[PDB]
Design a protein around this ligand. Structure first.
Ligand SMILES: *[C@@H]1O[C@H](CO)[C@@H](O[C@@H]2O[C@H](CO)[C@@H](O[C@@H]3O[C@H](CO)[C@@H](O)[C@H](O)[C@@H]3O)[C@H](O)[C@H]2NC(C)=O)[C@H](O)[C@H]1NC(C)=O
Ligand code: NAG
Ligand code: NAG
Ligand code: NAG
Lengths: 43, 706, 215, 89, 200
């Protein structure tokens, strides 16, 4: 029952405290950036 | 013995060991038994109950796929990606937040050992007395305060046991008191190479290495063994060799230590005391080491109380050299199920006699060191860890799969000080590169006009000759059309000559067989001599004096005896080196030299050009070796660019090549990451059928041919 | 521009902040900054000095909150090294809290109040989960007056209402408001504002969400 | 530690776990302040249920019945109070 | 008010009532209730600072034979095998203390033990009938290594879930045909662990 099933543990109040650089060549002054992030276990 | 019915393992194999007193579960890489490894046939007529971590009921015993511990937390950062479970060779990128500096390996993949490669990734801000001790994978940290006298607590999740320090306290020097914790399992074992590395790092001081002591002072060693009812066979077969090698090795550092010997089955026995006049002589202590015999239980408290009596003195005032002597206890317990109390209190007494656990201004923690080696799968890791010592950046607790690794460690330690001349030497450096694990491999590129370049590999067997396959090259190729690379070096080496077997021919054209691989071997003679380096290092050859001394046998041993030992009439373990994305790895493969051989040779009918062969035995000569497939175990196939590699059988931490890869049944290698037929087998060319040619051509290399 | 990841913290966590050093063109520039972390009493507990050379205006710093600490309004004061009077401030809470499971808003149908209303003042309750759903529970509503540096409560206007599918309908009558104070004239209430304090308890009695529409 | 006029008015906190005598050396020229405070727990545990006097009873009757008697500890009565009751299984 | 039931449930848990003002929740008064418990308070045994509640079973089962003793006495978790004689019992409300005198110890424990020193043991009130302890009689017991409780040398061995205590008849009762087999098996098992002991 509750042995092979994982639970939710990561419940932060602030995450994604990251930095990112826009280096794609401009297209009318707009740069598209496709980045993969994982939302927290919190609902 | 107990009833043998209903004790097997699904997906694995079971055998009766200790004359039916036990049974052991084994599966190849990527699978370990669950939830236990061995069962004991008690006196009730039934084996020991299947005990899990929570002591639950088990429907059936199966060997489960190797997964990898999930990060219980990674504070101040993120890990990519996140999964409920991590497979073998899966990779994580550890990324820090802003203003936090990373220390450790970011790109971490965890191998079949069950631990992630590299140092634990830590993100630190550096604004305290001491730094973040890290949060190892599977272990979760309590306490964000890193000031002085502050302590943090570490503990593991379900199914994981903690090995290290349950609580680490920040020291006035700026460090933490204890070793870095880790989450361990029952299937996990420490390889002999890293055990030897950690033992050397803790025991010695790197420069070479040396064992320094206080000026005008000596050291004492207390070698303690266990006479438990687990192996105890033939007067500690191998353990005596281990201790003899250790005694010989320690005396080679320019210091004469003193020794003491403790063995216990029901009561402790004294063999050598520190007070003896001739306790500093290796010859007599080894001679007495060879005089150990059996006469049950595990009474460790009484034995270490006897050791306490040895350490203690009978004088009123403390004798001379009381604070200038260093003590080392080495324990080789296979059991340690307590009977008569716990040995923690006597360790406390021992360190109180030497004034260790009483003051912090002069801790004197380095004058006592306890090393405990774990043998077998019945080990209790928390008890061993609580019994041994803990100092930061050092490992005092070890664990090995079998008794063989116990002497593998010490043979490697002996061979470390040897000159680089002998083959088979591979040191597991802490910060090694790709070729630091497989230095014998050499790559050969063939450039042809208007034709695709052909890439193959071979083994460096000396300073002038490289053994490889012959079908990778043709007589049409000229001297300028062959390039050789070793150790990932851009600089090339000029070639001089390539030698082929007189009976070798890559062209049975009238027999309907398109391709034939008889004596498909090639000997490349280098133009110059090879300089031995960190990643350039030779390999041994069958039926040679180097092979004779590698297998730890007297020189009178014959070549046929070596063939029987390395290649018995059963399944034979080995591995082959594969290249994937400019990186080198090892894939385990098994040789069928018994009943499975005749069937395996039939699988070649699936190879191209072998469907119309009338006599299936004609195309498969006895000089070939058939490996791979799913029987008796699942084995990956060699890739198209992986053909021609050296098949090597590992023994006593020594690499000896037994053949050269020739071809395979089908080309389905690329499906490994992405479906493999059960008949997919790999055929290689043996080296024992070309012994006279090897002796003739390599008679000037001084390889000690027999 | 000092921006923190949160607004309220617990003892035993980490304050993470970014200083964005711009110039009067709102453009990144490289300077030296002095940062102070002040306790609620008004004396710094940590000071630091960083440089913004080739950092593109982002100065990421962090601070560890001790487990034995004073609760209240903690301050971060950062100023350029050349200008000790150029103090920039960022105040954040330190409290012993736990995450609420829903947001409650109390909104008036008429966003102001009129003295001569013959019906009263109607305020409605929108208690919705933080993921935008609807609740079922009860709520307690009280009122008051926002005078000069004080708060006067009216226990007579202490009403209890069933939040019917994320909705409420509370009516404050003129007689109750008149009886709250002892002024013969209602026109003397001009120049002062009311505040509504609501507190919504779920049918499970789990969470505790006290929301105030002051002013 | 060193105290300078520019860097003064900073909380220099030194943390200690053991109760022992301390020795400070104040040298140089100027003045200063020193405070030593021990934060701990004391066994002055009084009653907390200060503002209420809840009492409960279960009594089988001729499907047992539950009775709850409450009282507010003060000189004035209480406003709308909330009583949460959790049933068994 | 009346509270009904619909399904019989084994080992129910006690409920609680919390009363508080609508503005402050931290100034609340939580009081538990239970038909067969004091203030709905789970049974825990304490010495003014440290507790480990004993809402478990006093024993397992009592049937048990020589092979049963062999299998359940060579466990990895057993620490001591002691025979004692009941001298004094201090009955009370929170718990009861049994003070014994030691004749001789089959197996040694991590605590200093010798013939003569007094030993105390604690059990929850629920064992006041299950074990039917009587004074001036001998007993033999072994238990989990987590029994240690107190300060040296006045430690106690808590009779918890894993603690196994069995009746050791004296010479007079060992002559009774009903207990002759038990006495003989006890003596043989005693001499077995005295001479040989458990394997490994
Ligand atoms: C990590 O490894 C697991 C297991 O090796 C991968 O799971 C893949 O899909 C199922 C789900 O567990 C595995 O189990 C087997 O699948 C067959 C269908 O082919 C089904 O009859 C059973 O459920 C059976 O147990 C399956 O072995 C495995 N796929 C392969 C090719 O081995 C998983 O995809 C891997 N990757 C990740 C990110 O988890
Ligand atoms: C980690 O690996 C990824 C791809 O495997 C690579 O893009 C990245 O540069 C690596 N990080 C390093 C080498 O620091
Ligand atoms: C082990 O040693 C004893 C005495 O030391 C000897 O009698 C016995 O034969 C030895 N066992 C062997 C050689 O297998
Ligand atoms: C060892 O102890 C003696 C006792 O007085 C002391 O004189 C000596 O200096 C000590 N040795 C050290 C500290 O190395």
């Amino acid at each position: 029952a509750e042995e092979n099933i994982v639970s939710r543990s990561e419940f932060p109040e602030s995450w994604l405290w990251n930095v990112e650089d826009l280096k794609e060549p401009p297209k009318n002054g707009i740069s598209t950036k496709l980045m993969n992030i994982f939302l927290k276990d919190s609902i | 013995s107990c009833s043998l019915e209903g004790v097997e393992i699904k997906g694995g194999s079971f055998r009766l060991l200790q004359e039916g007193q036990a049974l052991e579960y084994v599966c190849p890489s990527g699978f370990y038994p669950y939830p236990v490894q061995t069962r004991t046939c008690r006196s009730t007529g039934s084996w020991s109950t299947l005990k899990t971590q929570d002591q639950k009921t088990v429907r059936k015993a199966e060997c489960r796929a190797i997964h990898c511990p999930r990060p219980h937390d990674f504070e101040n950062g993120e890990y990519w990606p996140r999964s409920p479970y991590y497979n073998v060779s899966d990779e994580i990128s550890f990324h820090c937040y802003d203003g936090y500096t990373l220390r450790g390996s970011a790109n971490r993949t965890c191998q079949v050992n069950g631990r992630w490669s590299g140092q634990t990734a830590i993100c630190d801000n550096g604004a305290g007395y001491c730094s973040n001790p890290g949060i190892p994978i599977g272990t979760r940290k309590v306490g964000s305060q890193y000031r002085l006298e502050d302590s943090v607590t570490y503990h593991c999740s379900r199914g994981l046991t903690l090995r290290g320090s349950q609580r680490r306290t920040c020291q006035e020097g700026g460090s933490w008191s204890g070793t870095e914790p880790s989450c361990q399992d029952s299937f996990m074992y420490d390889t002999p190479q890293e055990v030897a590395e950690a033992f050397l790092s803790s025991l010695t001081e790197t420069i070479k290495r040396k064992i320094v002591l206080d000026p005008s002072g000596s050291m004492n060693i207390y070698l303690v063994l266990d006479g438990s009812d687990s192996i105890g066979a033939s007067n500690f077969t191998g353990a005596k060799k281990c201790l003899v090698n250790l005694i010989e090795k320690v005396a080679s550092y320019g210091v004469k230590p003193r020794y003491g010997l403790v063995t216990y089955a029901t009561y402790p026995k004294i063999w050598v005391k520190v007070s003896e006049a001739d306790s500093s002589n290796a010859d007599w202590v080894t001679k007495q080491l060879n005089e150990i015999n059996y006469e049950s239980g595990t009474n460790t408290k009484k034995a270490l109380q006897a050791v306490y009596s040895m350490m203690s003195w009978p004088d009123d005032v403390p004798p001379e050299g009381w604070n200038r002597t260093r003590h080392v206890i080495i324990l080789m317990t296979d059991g340690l199920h307590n009977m008569g109390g716990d040995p923690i209190t006597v360790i406390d007494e021992i360190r109180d006699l030497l004034y260790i656990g009483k003051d912090r201004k002069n801790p004197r923690e380095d004058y006592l060191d306890v090393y405990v080696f774990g043998v077998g799968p019945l080990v209790n890791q928390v008890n061993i860890n609580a019994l041994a010592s803990k100092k930061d950046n050092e490992q005092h607790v070890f664990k090995v799969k079998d008794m063989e690794n116990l002497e593998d460690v010490f043979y490697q330690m002996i061979d470390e000080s040897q000159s680089l001349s002998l083959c088979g030497m591979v040191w597991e450096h802490r910060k090694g590169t790709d070729y630091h694990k497989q230095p014998w491999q050499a790559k050969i590129s063939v450039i042809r006009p208007s034709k695709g370049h052909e890439s193959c590999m071979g083994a460096v067997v000396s300073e002038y000759f490289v053994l490889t396959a012959a079908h990778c090259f043709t007589v049409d190729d000229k001297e300028h059309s062959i390039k050789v690379s070793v150790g990932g070096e851009k600089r090339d080496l000029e070639i001089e000559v390539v030698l082929f077997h007189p009976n070798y021919n890559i062209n049975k054209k009238e027999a309907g067989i398109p391709e034939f691989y008889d004596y498909d071997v090639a000997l490349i003679k280098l133009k110059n001599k090879l300089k031995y380096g960190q990643t350039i290092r030779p390999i041994c050859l069958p039926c040679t004096e180097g092979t004779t001394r590698a297998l730890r046998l007297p020189p009178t041993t014959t070549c046929q005896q070596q063939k029987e030992e390395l290649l018995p009439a059963q399944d034979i373990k080995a591995l082959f080196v594969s290249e994937e994305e400019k990186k080198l790895t090892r894939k385990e493969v098994y040789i069928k030299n018994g009943d499975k051989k005749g069937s395996c040779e039939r699988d070649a009918q699936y190879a191209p050009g072998y469907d119309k062969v009338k006599d299936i035995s004609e195309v498969v000569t006895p000089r070939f070796l058939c490996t791979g497939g799913v029987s008796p175990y699942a084995d990956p196939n060699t890739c198209r660019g992986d053909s021609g590699g050296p098949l090597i059988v590992h023994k006593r931490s020594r690499f000896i090549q037994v053949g050269v890869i020739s071809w395979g049944v089908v080309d389905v290698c690329k499906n490994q990451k992405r479906q493999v037929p059960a008949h997919a087998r790999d055929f290689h060319i043996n080296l024992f059928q070309v012994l006279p040619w090897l002796k003739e051509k390599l008679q000037d290399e001084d390889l000690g041919f027999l | 521009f000092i921006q923190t990841d949160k607004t309220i913290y617990t003892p035993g966590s980490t304050v993470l902040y970014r200083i964005f050093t711009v110039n009067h063109k709102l453009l990144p520039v490289g300077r030296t900054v002095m940062v102070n972390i002040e306790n609620p009493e008004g004396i710094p507990v940590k000071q630091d000095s960083l440089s913004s050379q080739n950092q593109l205006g982002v100065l990421p710093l962090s601070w560890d909150i001790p487990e034995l600490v004073n609760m209240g309004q903690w301050k971060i004061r950062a100023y350029y090294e050349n200008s000790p009077q150029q103090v920039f401030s960022t105040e954040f809470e330190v409290k012993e809290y736990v995450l609420p499971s829903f947001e409650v808003i109390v909104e008036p149908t008429e966003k102001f109040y009129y003295i001569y209303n013959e019906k009263g003042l109607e305020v409605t309750i929108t208690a919705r989960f933080l993921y935008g759903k609807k609740v079922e529970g009860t709520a307690f509503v009280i009122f008051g007056i926002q005078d000069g540096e004080q708060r006067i409560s009216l226990p007579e206007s202490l009403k209890r209402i069933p939040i019917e599918d994320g909705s409420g309908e509370v009516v404050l009558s003129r007689k109750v408001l008149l009886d709250g104070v002892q002024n013969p004239r209602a026109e003397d209430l001009v120049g002062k504002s009311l505040y509504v304090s609501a507190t919504v308890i779920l049918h499970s009695g789990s969470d505790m969400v006290q929301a105030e529409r002051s002013g | 530690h060193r105290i300078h006029w520019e860097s003064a008015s900073l909380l220099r906190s030194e943390e200690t776990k053991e109760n022992e005598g301390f020795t400070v050396t104040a040298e140089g020229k100027g003045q200063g302040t020193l405070s030593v405070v021990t934060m701990y727990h004391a066994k002055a545990k009084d009653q907390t249920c200060n503002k209420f006097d809840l009492k409960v009873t279960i009594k089988p009757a001729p499907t047992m019945i539950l009775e709850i008697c409450t009282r507010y500890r003060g000189d004035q009565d209480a406003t709308m109070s909330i009583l949460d009751i959790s049933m068994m299984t | 008010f009346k509270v009904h039931q619909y399904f019989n449930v084994e080992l129910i848990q006690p409920g609680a009532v919390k009363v508080y003002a609508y503005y402050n929740l931290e100034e609340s008064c939580t009081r538990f209730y239970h038909p067969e418990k004091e203030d709905g308070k789970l049974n825990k045994l304490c010495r003014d600072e440290l507790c480990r509640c004993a809402e478990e079973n006093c024993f397992i089962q009592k049937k048990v034979t020589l092979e049963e003793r062999l299998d359940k006495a060579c466990e990895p978790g057993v620490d001591y095998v002691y025979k004692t004689r009941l001298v004094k019992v201090q009955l009370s409300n929170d718990f009861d203390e049994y003070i014994m005198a030691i004749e001789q110890t089959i197996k040694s424990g991590s605590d200093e033990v010798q013939v003569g020193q007094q030993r105390t043991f604690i059990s929850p009130i629920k064992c006041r009938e299950a074990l039917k302890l009587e004074e001036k009689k001998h007993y033999l017991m072994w238990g989990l290594s987590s029994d240690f409780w107190g300060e040296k040398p006045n430690l106690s061995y808590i009779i918890g879930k894993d603690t196994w205590v069995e009746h050791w008849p004296e010479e007079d009762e060992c002559q009774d045909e009903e207990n002759q087999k038990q006495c003989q098996d006890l003596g043989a098992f005693t001499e077995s662990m005295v001479v040989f002991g458990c394997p490994n």
